[PDB]
Design an enzyme around this catalytic site. Sequence first.
Site, PDB file in Angstrom:
ATOM      1  N   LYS A 154      -4.037   6.435  -7.166  1.00 14.87           N
ATOM      2  CA  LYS A 154      -2.600   6.265  -7.351  1.00 14.87           C
ATOM      3  C   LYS A 154      -2.226   4.778  -7.398  1.00 14.87           C
ATOM      4  CE  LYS A 154       1.876   7.073  -5.181  1.00 14.87           C
ATOM      5  NZ  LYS A 154       2.666   7.679  -4.075  1.00 14.87           N
ATOM      6  N   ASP A 191      -0.171   3.860  -2.616  1.00 12.97           N
ATOM      7  CA  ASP A 191      -0.356   4.219  -1.205  1.00 12.97           C
ATOM      8  C   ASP A 191      -1.146   5.522  -0.907  1.00 12.97           C
ATOM      9  OD1 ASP A 191       1.787   5.972  -2.030  1.00 12.97           O
ATOM     10  OD2 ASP A 191       2.558   6.008   0.020  1.00 12.97           O
ATOM     11  N   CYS A 192      -2.039   5.993  -1.787  1.00 18.00           N
ATOM     12  CA  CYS A 192      -2.738   7.244  -1.467  1.00 18.00           C
ATOM     13  C   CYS A 192      -3.811   7.055  -0.372  1.00 18.00           C
ATOM     14  CB  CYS A 192      -3.296   7.919  -2.717  1.00 18.00           C
ATOM     15  SG  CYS A 192      -4.023   9.546  -2.408  1.00 18.00           S
ATOM     16  N   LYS A 237       2.140   9.541 -16.154  1.00 17.50           N
ATOM     17  CA  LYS A 237       0.750   9.940 -16.369  1.00 17.50           C
ATOM     18  C   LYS A 237       0.251   9.687 -17.796  1.00 17.50           C
ATOM     19  CE  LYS A 237       1.546  13.645 -13.684  1.00 17.50           C
ATOM     20  NZ  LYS A 237       1.939  13.381 -12.277  1.00 17.50           N
ATOM     21  N   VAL A 243      -4.926  13.055  -7.745  1.00 14.69           N
ATOM     22  CA  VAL A 243      -5.684  11.852  -7.365  1.00 14.69           C
ATOM     23  C   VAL A 243      -6.150  11.954  -5.884  1.00 14.69           C
ATOM     24  CG1 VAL A 243      -4.959  10.215  -9.191  1.00 14.69           C
ATOM     25  CG2 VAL A 243      -3.627  10.338  -7.052  1.00 14.69           C
ATOM     26  N   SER A 251     -10.983  14.321  -1.794  1.00 20.74           N
ATOM     27  CA  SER A 251     -11.645  13.231  -1.058  1.00 20.74           C
ATOM     28  C   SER A 251     -12.726  13.700  -0.091  1.00 20.74           C
ATOM     29  CB  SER A 251     -10.639  12.323  -0.349  1.00 20.74           C
ATOM     30  OG  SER A 251      -9.999  12.922   0.764  1.00 20.74           O
ATOM     31  N   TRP A 290       6.798   6.859   0.867  1.00 24.68           N
ATOM     32  CA  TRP A 290       7.282   7.757   1.913  1.00 24.68           C
ATOM     33  C   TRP A 290       8.799   7.954   1.909  1.00 24.68           C
ATOM     34  CZ3 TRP A 290       4.557  11.278   4.275  1.00 24.68           C
ATOM     35  CH2 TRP A 290       3.174  11.097   4.438  1.00 24.68           C
ATOM     36  N   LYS A 321      10.589  11.236   0.955  1.00 31.87           N
ATOM     37  CA  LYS A 321      10.219  12.321   1.869  1.00 31.87           C
ATOM     38  C   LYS A 321      10.916  12.229   3.235  1.00 31.87           C
ATOM     39  CE  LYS A 321       5.831  12.921  -0.524  1.00 31.87           C
ATOM     40  NZ  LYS A 321       4.462  13.457  -0.315  1.00 31.87           N
TER      41      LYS A 321
END
Lengths: 213, 213
Positions: free
Chosen positions: B9, B20-21, B48, B61, B75, B208, B211
């Site tokens: 990301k 920030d992933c 994208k 991702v 991951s 963030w 959210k």
Amino acid sequence: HMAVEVCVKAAVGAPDILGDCPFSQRVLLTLEEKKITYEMKLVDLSNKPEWFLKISPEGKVPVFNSGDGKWIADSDVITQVIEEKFPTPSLVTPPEYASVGSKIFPSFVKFLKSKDASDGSEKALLDELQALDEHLKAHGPYISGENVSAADLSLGPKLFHLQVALEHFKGWKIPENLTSVHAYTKALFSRESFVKTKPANQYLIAGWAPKVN
Amino acid sequence: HMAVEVCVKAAVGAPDILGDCPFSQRVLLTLEEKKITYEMKLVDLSNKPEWFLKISPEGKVPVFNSGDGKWIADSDVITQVIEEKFPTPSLVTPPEYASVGSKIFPSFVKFLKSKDASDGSEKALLDELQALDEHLKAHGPYISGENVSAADLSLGPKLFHLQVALEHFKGWKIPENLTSVHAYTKALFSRESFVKTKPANQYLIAGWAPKVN
């Protein structure tokens, strides 16, 4: 060096009988299809043995050893570690078809646990199977065409659980107007690897029984 | 044959800036620590590109290529595929320490999103960090002793997000009486691999912000 090994769930109170784990069955399906020599070690999770708690201290199944002595958990992790270490015969599913049937299993558990008919759970499950039917009609007989891939080895056990648990507890069956889902489950379940690694209906139902009440 | 590749990301509206992933950062931390030559490909998920949707059609991702042309997601899957294909230097965490700090990240998001002080979210998070502190005091400086392993490369990014997001949005910091957590984050965050792969506080907070509301 070490042998290829997989620890899976045994039937409760029968350590020599294969249990109902559909994540363990996915790993077993992968090991069979790739014609790899391995050993299945059965664990009764209600009576976790000494050797098992050494190998997997958090008591989770399946756990796999590729012959290096390093035990790894998670069926997504395991089947991909197997694909890298044993690439032939390929079971790679194209990423375009990776998430096909992803919401079927959670929707099955939702409808199984349900007590209300006005719940919307049945329709939500039916809609998920209708989408799978459409995909199979267009790009079948399997998730990625003419040949079995990883996605089939994952979805197959999940559809088998859906079939046995919903018939027993609800009298519900995948509707026969979903011809592509039916040719798919007819083809997949009749495979030498599936027949071998499938749990007896008995242990599938017994496993789900406490979660239904 | 093909190069080692990872898609992660990017910062929203800045395709040349690392996003920030924390799952992408775990994979980047693994690739750095194993001194593997690879290429980081940045994807702005709000815009994208064509090539990205070919490689990962579900727009998820991180996605990784070990040099074989086969793109893989998740991951947990990726870092274990890397451990098998590139075993030296070992980053294997013993399974006895595998689930250490497992509930910290969900508890962080719970407390961050919270609007109520009588919620119990703060205490639930503090209890999770107190347990990590105890484990580190007893078996540290890292999750598996004197040396960095896989579990550190997973937890490290999660604790970094917790640190930046809770200070910014709540004025909350991991309490300093948790000496082992602090020596752990002080040691981990100062590592050459962490400093390199960490997102700017700016992009962590921006990510963030929607959210929290």
